[PDB]
Structure formats: C-alpha cells, structure tokens
C-alpha cells in the first residue's frame, strides 16, 4: 500500500539529516521507496529562529503501518543525525509523519490517513502534490489545495 511520510529536517546541512530517514525508509523490512522529490526550504517560526530547513515529500509502499514505519525512520534519526544525545538542541534531527495510508480510513496516533494539521502545513502537502496530485480522497481534498486555502499556496523549491 502507498503511504506518505513527509520528512522534515533542518540545521546548517540538512542533507545528512534527511539521508538518515532515506536510509531506513530506503529498504524497510517490507517497505520500498516509490516517489520522493520536491526539495525546498521552510522557516522555523517557533522551534527555532534560524531559517533554512530542507523538507521533501516521500511516498513508499509500506506493508507495516506508520506505527512500525516511523519507528525505523526515526530510529536512524535517533542514532544518526547527531543525536549524540537527542540532537542535543533544537536544529538537526528528523521529523517525518504519515499523511496517508493507502487512501483508506484509519486514524489513531502514529497513523492518520485524513491527516491533521495538514491544512496548516504547506511544507508537506505541496511537495507530495508534485509527486502525486490526485490523493485527495483521504479526506476529500488533495494536499496543496488544502494548504492553498489554509496555509500558503506554493513554497520555493529551496
């Protein structure tokens, strides 16, 4: 089933951080990357004050619910992106959540197809909108069109 794991990451060189997830997410026990692109920048506004970041949408065919999925992804983020002790400070680390899960309906905590906070998260829906602008169904609305009327309209490609 095609799932969506929008990876975040930031700090000076987010290239390494992002790659952390790309590693596990790359060859997960039963998952496999399918569509991943749309690299851009996002302003901290809250967690930090250092503008940079490097977000990119990902959609791989995972056989294990985001529960296990995220475990592996953040697993690397828990022993790769610095994390010599929980990334120490604000910047760095990874933050990839699941947006959809086969377009079906399944909400819990680690998994939520309808996906919350999406509307106010143009830096997660817009990217995947490039690799697949037909999801919508999950909640009845696409990804960018929700942020287009709620969040932004189209962020810059880094």
Which residues partner with 101 through β-bridges? Answer: 3
DSSP3 helix / strand / coil % (the chain, rounded to 5) = 25, 20, 55
For residue 83 the two structure tokens come to 């994390």
CATH of domain 1-158: 3.30.70.560
The residues spanned by each domain of the chain are 1-158
Residues contacting 129, CB < 8 A, separation 6+: 38, 57, 142, 143, 144
For residue 45, give the 3-state DSSP assignment.
Answer: coil
Q: Which of 82, 121, 139, 144 is catalytic?
A: 82
How far apart are alpha carbons 90 and 19 in whole angstroms? 19
Which residues partner with 42 through β-bridges? Answer: 52
- Structural determination approach: NMR
Cα 105 to Cα 27, 126, 137, distances in angstroms: 26, 21, 10
Contact in structure between 25 and 31 (CB atoms under 8 Å): yes
Contact in structure between 103 and 138 (CB atoms under 8 Å): yes
Contact in structure between 58 and 7 (CB atoms under 8 Å): yes
Q: Is 95 a catalytic residue?
A: yes
Distance from the Cα of residue 93 to its chain's centroid: 13
For residue 27 the two structure tokens come to 């060859």
Q: Is 49 a catalytic residue?
A: no
Which residues partner with 109 through β-bridges? Answer: none
Q: Which of 52, 75, 95, 150 is catalytic?
A: 95
Q: Is 82 a catalytic residue?
A: yes
Contact in structure between 36 and 1 (CB atoms under 8 Å): no
Q: Is 97 a catalytic residue?
A: yes
How far apart are alpha carbons 23 and 50 in whole angstroms? 26
Buried b (16+ CB within 10 A) or exposed e, 77-87: beebbbbeeeb
For residue 10 the two structure tokens come to 């930031």
């Amino acid at each position: 089933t095609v799932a969506y794991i929008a990876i975040g990451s930031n700090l000076a060189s987010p290239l390494e951080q992002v790659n952390a997830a790309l590693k596990a997410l790359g060859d997960i026990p039963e998952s496999h990357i399918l569509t991943v692109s749309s690299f851009y920048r996002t302003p901290p506004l809250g967690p930090q004050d250092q503008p940079d970041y490097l977000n990119a949408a990902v959609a791989l065919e995972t056989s294990l619910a985001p529960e296990e999925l995220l475990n592996h992804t953040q697993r690397i983020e828990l022993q790769q992106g610095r994390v010599r002790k929980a990334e120490r400070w604000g910047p760095r680390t990874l933050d990839l959540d699941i947006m959809l899960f086969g377009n079906e309906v399944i909400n819990t905590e680690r998994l939520t197809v309808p996906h919350y906070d999406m509307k106010n998260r143009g830096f997660m829906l817009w990217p995947l909108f490039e690799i697949a602008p037909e999801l919508v169904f999950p909640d009845g609305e696409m990804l960018r069109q929700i942020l287009h009327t709620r969040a932004f309209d189209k962020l810059n490609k880094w």
